[PDB]
Amino acid sequence: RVLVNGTFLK
Amino acid sequence: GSHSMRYFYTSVSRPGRGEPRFIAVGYVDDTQFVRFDSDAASQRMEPRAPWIEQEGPEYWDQETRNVKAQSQTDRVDLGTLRGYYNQSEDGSHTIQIMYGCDVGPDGRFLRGYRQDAYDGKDYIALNEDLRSWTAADMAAQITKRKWEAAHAAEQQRAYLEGRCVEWLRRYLENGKETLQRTDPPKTHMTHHPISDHEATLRCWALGFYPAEITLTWQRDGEDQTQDTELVETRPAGDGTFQKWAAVVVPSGEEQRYTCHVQHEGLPKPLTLRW
Amino acid sequence: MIQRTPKIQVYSRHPAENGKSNFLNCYVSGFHPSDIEVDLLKNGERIEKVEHSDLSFSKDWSFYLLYYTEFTPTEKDEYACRVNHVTLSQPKIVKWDRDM
């Protein structure tokens, strides 16, 4: 499964 | 032996009108099991292996929503990085993100990974300790300090040691008949005259899984690398892999040459002679 | 920007024999950026409805793709793959050779 919230804004 | 779960994301800006092209792929070892493509009609995360199809409607609904949230972050980050590097609106740029976990043969966490690229070069990476970041330039330095303040490493580490390994273990069980199965290489050798005095010996390995393999040539029991050609390992398209190793030899002397095959599926290394 | 030239392999999924149903593969790898034009040809003509794998990449960030189609090898028909990318001086045609 993928990260729930995804990566943090760059 | 050891198993891995990896996710790969690619976001490409489309300066002429519209959102970027976003593609996400999930792998368990050398098997792709899911995909999301922003250009496809469904707009859903889709199964790419039979053993994942058994996941319920809410698994697919959540995977679809979570991967779409990553595509929006990528959309915003393409705009942000363009500013950091002082690039124009007219160009196409790329962000790549890879992350994943490795488990032992039993099922416990071995290691985690996370790394991001911009325009095909390293941008920012999570370090081996899963607690600190490596920024390749001053633009990535701005991101690192945002991520240090926001505790981004702690959320990535928690996923990698938690949910990542929990779900990889479930996948390994669900797809055990194929994921835990090793397919040894099917080997043969061919002979191709170049002239009446020289010939190529080609040693083939077909239908193997996993992709990891070693093909080496020996002349009279000593390692030969001169006049050899090894192609990169390639997908057969059915889940299996292929590779060949070739050597140019004097015609009449092909019995001096032996090809040696090493693969996880072979209880003992294999030898081929013409 | 960084530019990496594609490496190309053209081959069949199974050992090839004339008259026997198989799959013609064109594996493209080690390229950057991801925009690439890949075509499979039969006697210099584009095969329609050719499928491809989902864009993925290696540890060095370079891309790879597999393009494929069902085909039946013959003694007479010539199969090839045609690749175009920003890194090539001209479109690259790699012929299918049963022995490679």
Numbering used by the authors:
A (entry chain C): 1 to 10
B (entry chain A): 1 to 274
C (entry chain B): 0 to 99
Provide excerpts from the study.
The HLA-A*11:01 allele is a member of the HLA-A*03 supertype and is prominent in many Asian and Oceanian populations, including Indigenous populations who are a high-risk group for severe disease with influenza virus infection. CD8+ T cells recognize peptides presented on HLA class I (HLA-I) molecules and can form long-lasting memory after being primed by an immunogenic epitope. Whilst HLA-A*11:01 favours peptides possessing Val, Ser and Thr at P2 and basic (Arg and Lys) residues at the C-terminus, HLA-A*02:01 favours those possessing Leu and Met at P2 and hydrophobic (Val and Leu) residues at the C-terminus. Structures comprising of HLA-A*11:01 in complex with the IBV peptides NP511-520, M141-49 and NS1186-195 were solved at a resolution of 2.08, 2.95 and 1.82 Å, respectively.
The 10-mer NS1186-195 peptide anchors to HLA-A*11:01 by P2-Val and P10-Lys as well as secondary anchors P3-Leu and P7-Thr. P10-Lys is buried deep in the F pocket of the HLA-A*11:01. Overlay of the NS1186-195 and NP511-520 peptides display strikingly distinct conformations with an average r.m.s.d. of 1.7 Å for the Cα atoms, and only shared homology for their main anchor residues. Despite these striking differences, the antigen binding cleft of HLA-A*11:01 for both complexes showed little change with an average r.m.s.d. of 0.44 Å. While stimulation with NP511-520 and NS1186-195 did not result in significantly increased CD8+ T cell activation, some donors had lower magnitude responses that were still above the basal IFN-γ+CD8+ T cell frequencies observed in the negative control (n = 5 and n = 4, respectively), which suggests that these peptides form subdominant epitopes with HLA-A*11:01. CD8+ T cells stimulated with M141-49 and NS1186-195 were found to have significantly higher proportions of polyfunctionality when compared to the negative control. HLA-A*11:01 heavy chain was refolded with each of IAV- (PB2320-331, PB2323-331 or PB1659-669) or IBV-derived peptides (NP511-520, M141-49 or NS1186-195) and a thermal stability assay was performed using differential scanning fluorimetry. Four of the peptide-HLA (pHLA) complexes exhibited a thermal stability (Tm) of about 60°C, in the range of other previously reported pHLA complexes. The conservation of IBV peptides was 99.9% for M141-49 and NS1186-195 and 90.7% for NP511-520 across all IBVs from both the Yamagata and Victoria lineages detected from 1936–2019. Therefore, the crystal structures are characteristic of the HLA-A*11:01 B and F pockets and give a rational for the preferred residues observed for 9-, 10- and 11-mer peptides eluted from HLA-A*11:01 molecule. These structures represent the first insight into IBV epitope presentation by HLA-A*11:01 molecule, and their diverse conformations suggest that a diverse T cell repertoire might be able to recognise them.
